[PDB]
């Protein structure tokens, strides 16, 4: 029997703390993304990039289109890493970890969290871009010449399955915190402090999913199983990043100034 006791109440307070920080860190939420995608918002209707002519017009509303699109992907990922890091600072205990362990956690976690949260902005048709100002079709991205054509497609394949779980921002805030505090990342100095925070976040996540999803009794287990899909996504992603570095040309301004 689940009881609303001091321990559970504290787990609900930890869930709310993360939700609030999530809202502050992440400009476009799943609630707002889904409103846009289903046409249930009063906000400005996104511009749809579905062919080469709608890309050209969209770049208003590199000589090579595929490269320009990859360039925008790259700059967006720098921005996303900054937002995830701000979020990570809000997770109780995280900034109190050794700074090298904080860095290691984010360096191995950010890609998993990027594709988790990009699914909130995705459907079978495409993905919201420019904080919901544009919509780029999955088939238009698939049409880009090798090796760019197959770059986003595995993230769509993940996302239509992931979205079927019908997680909401309250669920995702805790899920992402669980990803960040993974004690199994290579090169971690002090593992037990990370495991202890992860254990508290796993308790909070399990309780979140029991209260919020009465019709999937094992959603908690299903979500933990999604971490293998994410690891594979990131393994395959990193392989494609290399092939693009070996075989193409293109830095974000922040990166240029850091040197």
């Amino acid at each position: 029997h689940m009881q609303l006791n001091p321990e559970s109440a504290d787990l609900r307070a930890l869930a709310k703390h993360l939700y609030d920080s999530y809202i502050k860190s992440f400009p476009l939420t799943k609630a707002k993304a889904r409103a846009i995608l289903t046409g249930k918002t009063t906000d400005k209707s996104p511009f749809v990039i579905y062919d080469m002519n709608s890309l050209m017009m969209g770049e208003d509303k590199s000589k090579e289109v595929a490269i320009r699109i990859f360039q925008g992907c790259q700059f967006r990922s720098v921005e996303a890493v900054q937002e995830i890091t701000e979020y990570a600072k809000s997770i109780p205990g995280f900034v109190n970890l050794d700074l090298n362990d904080q860095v290691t956690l984010l360096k191995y976690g950010v890609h998993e969290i990027i594709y988790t949260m990009l699914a909130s902005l995705m459907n079978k048709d495409g993905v919201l871009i420019s904080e919901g100002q544009g919509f780029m079709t999955r088939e238009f991205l698939k049409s880009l010449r090798k090796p760019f054509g197959d770059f986003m497609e595995p993230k769509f394949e993940f996302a239509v399955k992931f979205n079927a779980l019908e997680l909401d921002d309250s669920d995702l805030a805790i899920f992402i915190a669980v990803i960040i505090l993974s004690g199994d990342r290579p090169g971690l100095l002090n593992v037990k402090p990370i495991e202890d925070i992860q254990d508290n976040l796993l308790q909070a996540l399990e309780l979140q999913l029991k209260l919020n999803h009465p019709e999937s009794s094992q959603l908690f287990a299903k979500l933990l199983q999604k971490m293998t899909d994410l690891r594979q996504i990131v393994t395959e992603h990193v392989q494609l990043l290399q092939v693009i570095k070996k075989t193409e040309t293109d830095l974000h301004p922040l990166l240029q100034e850091i040197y």
């Binding site: 890493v81 890091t85 860095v103 360096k107 950010v110 974000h252 850091i258």
Partner: peptide
Amino acid sequence: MGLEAIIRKALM
């Protein structure tokens, strides 16, 4: 290397 730079800056 590039990823780590951005993370370290953002934590400060």
